[PDB]
Amino acid sequence: GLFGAIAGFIEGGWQGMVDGWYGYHHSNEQGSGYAADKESTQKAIDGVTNKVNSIIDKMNTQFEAVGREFNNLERRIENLNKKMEDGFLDVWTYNAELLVLMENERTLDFHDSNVKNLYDKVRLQLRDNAKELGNGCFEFYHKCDNECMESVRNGTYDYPQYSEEARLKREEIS
Amino acid sequence: GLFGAIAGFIEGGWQGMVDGWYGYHHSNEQGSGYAADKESTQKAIDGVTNKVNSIIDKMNTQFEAVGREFNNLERRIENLNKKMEDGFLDVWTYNAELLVLMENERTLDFHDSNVKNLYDKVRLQLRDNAKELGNGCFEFYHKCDNECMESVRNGTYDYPQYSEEARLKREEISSG
Amino acid sequence: GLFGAIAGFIEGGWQGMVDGWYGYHHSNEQGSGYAADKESTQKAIDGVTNKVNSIIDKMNTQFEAVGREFNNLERRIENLNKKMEDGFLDVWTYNAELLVLMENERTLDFHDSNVKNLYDKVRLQLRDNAKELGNGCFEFYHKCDNECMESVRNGTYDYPQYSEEARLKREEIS
Amino acid sequence: DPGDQICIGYHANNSTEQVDTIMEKNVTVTHAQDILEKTHNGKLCDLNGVKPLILKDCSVAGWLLGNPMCDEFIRVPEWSYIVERANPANDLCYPGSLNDYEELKHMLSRINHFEKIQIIPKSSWPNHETSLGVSAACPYQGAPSFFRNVVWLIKKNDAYPTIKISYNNTNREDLLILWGIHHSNNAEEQTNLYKNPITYISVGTSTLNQRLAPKIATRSQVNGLRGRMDFFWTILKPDDAIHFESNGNFIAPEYAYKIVKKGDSTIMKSGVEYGHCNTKCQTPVGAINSSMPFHNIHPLTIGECPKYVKSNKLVLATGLRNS
Amino acid sequence: PGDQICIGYHANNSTEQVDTIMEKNVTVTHAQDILEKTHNGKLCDLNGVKPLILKDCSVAGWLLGNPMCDEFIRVPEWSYIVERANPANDLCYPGSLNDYEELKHMLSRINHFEKIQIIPKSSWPNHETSLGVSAACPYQGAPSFFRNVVWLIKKNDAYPTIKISYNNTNREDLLILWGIHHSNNAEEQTNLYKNPITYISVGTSTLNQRLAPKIATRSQVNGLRGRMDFFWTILKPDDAIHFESNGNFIAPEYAYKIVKKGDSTIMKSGVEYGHCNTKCQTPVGAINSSMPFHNIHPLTIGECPKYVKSNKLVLATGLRNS
Amino acid sequence: DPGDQICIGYHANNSTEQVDTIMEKNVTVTHAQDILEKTHNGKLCDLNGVKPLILKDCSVAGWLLGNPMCDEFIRVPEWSYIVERANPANDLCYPGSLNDYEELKHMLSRINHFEKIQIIPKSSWPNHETSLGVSAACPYQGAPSFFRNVVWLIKKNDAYPTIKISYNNTNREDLLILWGIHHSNNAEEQTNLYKNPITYISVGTSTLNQRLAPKIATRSQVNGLRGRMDFFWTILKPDDAIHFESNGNFIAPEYAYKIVKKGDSTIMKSGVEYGHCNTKCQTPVGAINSSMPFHNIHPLTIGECPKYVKSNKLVLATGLRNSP
Numbered sequence A, C: 001g002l003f004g005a006i007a008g009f010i011e012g013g014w015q016g017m018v019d020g021w022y023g024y025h026h027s028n029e030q031g032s033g034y035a036a037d038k039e040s041t042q043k044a045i046d047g048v049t050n051k052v053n054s055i056i057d058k059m060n061t062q063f064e065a066v067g068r069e070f071n072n073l074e075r076r077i078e079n080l081n082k083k084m085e086d087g088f089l090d091v092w093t094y095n096a097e098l099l100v101l102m103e104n105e106r107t108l109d110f111h112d113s114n115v116k117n118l119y120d121k122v123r124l125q126l127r128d129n130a131k132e133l134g135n136g137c138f139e140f141y142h143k144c145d146n147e148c149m150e151s152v153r154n155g156t157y158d159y160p161q162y163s164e165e166a167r168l169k170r171e172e173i174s
Numbered sequence B: 001g002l003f004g005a006i007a008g009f010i011e012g013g014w015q016g017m018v019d020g021w022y023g024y025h026h027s028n029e030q031g032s033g034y035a036a037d038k039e040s041t042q043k044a045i046d047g048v049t050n051k052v053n054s055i056i057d058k059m060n061t062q063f064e065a066v067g068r069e070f071n072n073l074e075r076r077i078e079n080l081n082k083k084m085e086d087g088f089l090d091v092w093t094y095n096a097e098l099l100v101l102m103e104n105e106r107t108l109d110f111h112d113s114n115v116k117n118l119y120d121k122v123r124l125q126l127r128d129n130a131k132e133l134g135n136g137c138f139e140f141y142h143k144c145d146n147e148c149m150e151s152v153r154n155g156t157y158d159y160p161q162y163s164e165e166a167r168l169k170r171e172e173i174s175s176g
Numbered sequence D: 001d002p003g004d005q006i007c008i009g010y011h012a013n014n015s016t017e018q019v020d021t022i023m024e025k026n027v028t029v030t031h032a033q034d035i036l037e038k039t040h041n042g043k044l045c046d047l048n049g050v051k052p053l054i055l056k057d058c059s060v061a062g063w064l065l066g067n068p069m070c071d072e073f074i075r076v077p078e079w080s081y082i083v084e085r086a087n088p089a090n091d092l093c094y095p096g097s098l099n100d101y102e103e104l105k106h107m108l109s110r111i112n113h114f115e116k117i118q119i120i121p122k123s124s125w126p127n128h129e130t131s132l133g134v135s136a137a138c139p140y141q142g143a144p145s146f147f148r149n150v151v152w153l154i155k156k157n158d159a160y161p162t163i164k165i166s167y168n169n170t171n172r173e174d175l176l177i178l179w180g181i182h183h184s185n186n187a188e189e190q191t192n193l194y195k196n197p198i199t200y201i202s203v204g205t206s207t208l209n210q211r212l213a214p215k216i217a218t219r220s221q222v223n224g225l226r227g228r229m230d231f232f233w234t235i236l237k238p239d240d241a242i243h244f245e246s247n248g249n250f251i252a253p254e255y256a257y258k259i260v261k262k263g264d265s266t267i268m269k270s271g272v273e274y275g276h277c278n279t280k281c282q283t284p285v286g287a288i289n290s291s292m293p294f295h296n297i298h299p300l301t302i303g304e305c306p307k308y309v310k311s312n313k314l315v316l317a318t319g320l321r322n323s
Numbered sequence E: 001p002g003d004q005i006c007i008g009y010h011a012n013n014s015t016e017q018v019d020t021i022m023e024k025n026v027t028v029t030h031a032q033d034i035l036e037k038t039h040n041g042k043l044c045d046l047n048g049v050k051p052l053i054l055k056d057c058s059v060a061g062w063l064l065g066n067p068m069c070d071e072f073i074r075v076p077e078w079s080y081i082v083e084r085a086n087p088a089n090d091l092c093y094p095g096s097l098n099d100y101e102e103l104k105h106m107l108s109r110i111n112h113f114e115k116i117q118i119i120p121k122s123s124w125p126n127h128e129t130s131l132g133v134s135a136a137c138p139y140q141g142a143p144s145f146f147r148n149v150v151w152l153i154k155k156n157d158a159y160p161t162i163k164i165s166y167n168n169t170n171r172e173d174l175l176i177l178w179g180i181h182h183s184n185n186a187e188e189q190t191n192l193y194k195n196p197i198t199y200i201s202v203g204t205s206t207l208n209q210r211l212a213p214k215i216a217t218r219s220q221v222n223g224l225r226g227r228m229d230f231f232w233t234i235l236k237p238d239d240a241i242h243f244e245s246n247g248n249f250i251a252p253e254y255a256y257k258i259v260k261k262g263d264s265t266i267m268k269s270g271v272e273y274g275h276c277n278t279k280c281q282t283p284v285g286a287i288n289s290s291m292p293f294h295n296i297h298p299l300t301i302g303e304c305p306k307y308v309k310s311n312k313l314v315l316a317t318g319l320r321n322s
Numbered sequence F: 001d002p003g004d005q006i007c008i009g010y011h012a013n014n015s016t017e018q019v020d021t022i023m024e025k026n027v028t029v030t031h032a033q034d035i036l037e038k039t040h041n042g043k044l045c046d047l048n049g050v051k052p053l054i055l056k057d058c059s060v061a062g063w064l065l066g067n068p069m070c071d072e073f074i075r076v077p078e079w080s081y082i083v084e085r086a087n088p089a090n091d092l093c094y095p096g097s098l099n100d101y102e103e104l105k106h107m108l109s110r111i112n113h114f115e116k117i118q119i120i121p122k123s124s125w126p127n128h129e130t131s132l133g134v135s136a137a138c139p140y141q142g143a144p145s146f147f148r149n150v151v152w153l154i155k156k157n158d159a160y161p162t163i164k165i166s167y168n169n170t171n172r173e174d175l176l177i178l179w180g181i182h183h184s185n186n187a188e189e190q191t192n193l194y195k196n197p198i199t200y201i202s203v204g205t206s207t208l209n210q211r212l213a214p215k216i217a218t219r220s221q222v223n224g225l226r227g228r229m230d231f232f233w234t235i236l237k238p239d240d241a242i243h244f245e246s247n248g249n250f251i252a253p254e255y256a257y258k259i260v261k262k263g264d265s266t267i268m269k270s271g272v273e274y275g276h277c278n279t280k281c282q283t284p285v286g287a288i289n290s291s292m293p294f295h296n297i298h299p300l301t302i303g304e305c306p307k308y309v310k311s312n313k314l315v316l317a318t319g320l321r322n323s324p
Ligand SMILES: CC(=O)N[C@H]1[C@H](O[C@@H]2[C@@H](O)[C@H](O)O[C@H](CO)[C@@H]2O)O[C@H](CO)[C@@H](O[C@@H]2O[C@H](CO[C@]3(C(=O)O)C[C@H](O)[C@@H](NC(C)=O)[C@H]([C@H](O)[C@H](O)CO)O3)[C@H](O)[C@H](O)[C@H]2O)[C@@H]1O
Pocket: D132, D133, D134, D135, D136, D137, D138, D144, D154, D183, D184, D185, D192, D193, D224, D225, D226, D227, D228
């Protein structure tokens, strides 16, 4: 919700998309289908893997032998140990719970930013050669075949090729 | 200012609106008024409530009896208790101060995105039928009444209904 | 990054920008050069300075005398000190690593946020009087002297000044 | 050209409350909430329904042994924590020491049941003097007296027969038994009090095996006395018998305490008055009733308390930037 | 119309729910729990070394050779000691072992351990060596005594003053144990040792100990009013220990060569041994590492996760599910 | 024709500084700062302007009792902490022990005022010999000697009359007083030194009440000596008196220490040389500057120190992401 993509102008997820976390759905004269953007999916996978690994690998563990070796006339000493063990339990329980809550919020917004950035990359390429539908989709003013659709997903969309056709379409609705 | 809305282009809150944390201000021939978006406001208030409750409820508190039970020939043990008590104070003091500093930054940026999300919602509907003034307002190129204001405030603005009406003024306004 | 700018529509950043962290590069008939936006870099300078100072200054330090003052028949008590010492080492090592990891992610996102916000301020001023190349640059539909170049940078770009001359370059040029 | 206008905006109010972020300082917000507890009631309260044992100016040692300046019989059969002053005035009227004193106080910090009973009546010493064991250092209303719960046995008719007495704990509860030994000042004083130049004390239970001997030596005056009295204690579990043997310098027990312990606490050093209040967390300066994660009232807390921190305010932003 | 390209994100049939700081029970496509909750329910070797498991005996009974404990076994090394919560077999003759808690802590992890005989029964030609027997320590229902120590009794109505010494010619530290018997009355003192007033002198390069019997009336424990206080010391190599006594001496017969290189604690558990290996052992079982946190048990031995009071620590990895 | 161009961009420089984020490792940044302290000067320094007491060849017990084989140094009236070697060369020339040694060491770790004074001169023993309490295990100036702050009293003219002496602390400061008992080896040695087969020591103050007897037995040889001497200590508060009674085996005091204690410290075990420096945080391997929140030098620190962590770098990113 931080970027208004995952729950905002894109109102839902696609069950048909199975080969990635983020991707595209196209619909042209040759048919409709799903295509997953692996450049974004891999970078998201590495970052999420790094975060989980960092949360795990950065923990420092040492050999400790935790028992109860104080007698009935050393209860002051064992109360010192009780305050130490209970204090550390409070420190770790509070740290662990909040670390999960804060990072889970961060992880969800990380996916949100990735989806938003994908939308802006496609939008920045099409410019006025396509129409922003406000729902995560662009309606082309020209004919974008399967090879043209791959160019949009490859960051190689050629604006000058379809400029006059798009302008003619824009005037065609006038 | 992480999303550039609160003090980036909106640049100022509205003391007039007392209904919610975010909302709209319409001004047409009928009059002027303040509207509050109950949807995003309720989400923000519920979201901040969870953050505050989580910071409070996750703290585990147990019975402890803290005193000074060691004598003049048990000072080395007392030093161990002192180092333990001082160590736990240092840990909690650092975490509590930094927890507030980090979460206060997130909460303010949480409010910043909600405004921009509301701003980007209206921007998509009007498209070319209204220009982008840049102060967080949309001056309609067409004429919009109180009923038409409601459509923008609940997400039902019909763009082609006022398309050419905007164009006649748009192609004439830019002529000077 | 999390907003799109550093390694986003901008690729690498400018080596010739030594007067600040964020700024502009103009190219008109009068020449070309680099310039920095004082307000944005100053906020970034203060923000990171506050972040580093907060991490340093908020730490509470007390006088302690740490030694080994227990004999061979007080090993149970010395074990208690070892468990306490190692427990605090684990707490501080874990927090310091994650705090460095997380705040570094925040810092780079903070720089990313400032660049995008600086872009949007220019974007909302030029409007249809300029065309965005999609790589962090803008194409004016008119003539922009060095006086008007500063107007974009200093927030005083007057929209009607070139709106008519813009149309003679975008709509007129078919 | 009165172009109809729709705007996007956010709340503002008159609040002057300010919070700090990791990058900015002194940011005014519309709403804010503090998570640091800063208020206490300023009185000593009951801990989870149980009243504390407050010793006004007596220590645990003087209260247990029966110092005449202390309460002759305390009413509390149950307490949650013991309140002592920084320096109790009536610790041990007769100079001496209490063995394992710090561990004994820890046990007595929270006691479920406490009742004084008489295990050895003074009529159990037919051949020893039970009425001369007094001292000017232990006065009651000016007149010489002694600890109320123990008997200072003295020779009768210039004779101190070997004592062999024992007590079986017929009760169903553990018994706290206290006894002592008196250290004479010289050989003549030892004869003038016990008639036996070389004396001993033997105390035996199922776990205790104690041999005491007086340390007759020159010492410095405390409360006007150069003599000393070292006191000892043990827990006589039910159906177990304590066995006493002595031929001099014996400070025999008269009263004992039936004790049941089901929880642990500690001794609180405070002078704050009782407040007829209940709480789950207690500090020497006042009890706190809070659910906040942190507090800055006092470090020496008893109960379920927030984490004591070195902070004046931990205020979280629950609202937007104000303007 | 047509020719649309849409941007979307993955979704699946997952019901996995994670909690965030601002929202609870958020269903996500994928998630991982970083809290360990599983143990094998078996006591394992700690980093390749088997624990020393005392079935029904305490360390005091096993050290002193209680006739109801086994006479040493193939335990030249152990990583930790497993005791029952209340071991039935202990000091059968009532008494005590000095610094018993400190002795157990040292013996928690031993690199090398080997019982040897330092003083044979032939070293007491003027005292009775077979008569030091009590009914409270029966071996086959017949009265006996601690196996590793000798209760010396008078011979020919005489207890000559003992002056014996042992030089630790071994290259490893030695653990030596001895005791003093506390009589019940004067008559019993002479019936056993013939000497009314007795003493024990124990001397090493560092130890200088004088012990005297405390003859008094005591309550019956295991049918006995008598008591025996046992003591121990670590005799460094090439050092010597000197014993001098004229009665009530519980003279050592066996001693243990000690090589200590690390430290452990005493584990109280009834869980059985599973012929396994682990880096972390809890009283209810062993746990495999790599998770930063766990909630199995606090009294752990080894490199273990941090013990917390949580039932779930679920990190969100996937996207918010629809 | 030429469309004027205005561009947005950020800063970049020639920097190889790398930081790690929660999701990316080894990210090159234009500028960075390390919040971890990693350097120590390799010296022992004064703590807040007060030089420590450095016992180079001696233990605290040997230094207090005046071990003749320990080097004599100039009087130090105050110190902030005590430095001992891991294994001091000289601890107790005569084998024995000092009672409550660890607690005494901890109390003496930080002393505001320390001054040795004479309380019982050797002229105060008319009926006991004061110069023969001497052993070859404690040489001094080429002659057999003993601990020089105490005196080992011996029988004179085959007689050891019972000692009954008292000392009143007329000073305004507390007094540290040490004494001891000699444990013989056999009955013959006892009589040859004190003439009394059964001996005792009684010490008494307003708080102290102690009785000792020699443990005459056979022990192993330490420094070539089978005898032992166990020393004891107490703090004689002002205007209080200490009373010594003995008929043999008494190691009488000659010197005591006027002591004033205000703060607390510990004993540092180190062999690092003194550096004639000042610091706010001392480690057994060197002093650190203590400006950063963390350090990774050593855990056994004295002073106001950063939090000790097991890390090699804690580098915060301050600049932007740097690109090649
Ligand atoms: C028993 C008594 O009165 N002793 C005092 C002594 O009296 C002598 C008497 O005991 C003996 O039988 O006969 C000779 C003459 O042949 C004396 O008459 O006289 C001493 C000199 O004044 C006293 O010393 C003073 O004792 C004070 C202690 O007062 C008390 C106390 O502390 O309560 C008084 C008690 O009556 C007494 N109790 C018993 C059972 O004897 C105790 C006790 O003696 C001591 O506490 C034992 O150490 O003492 C002050 O100490 C004062 O400073 C001192 O001069 C004899 O008390």
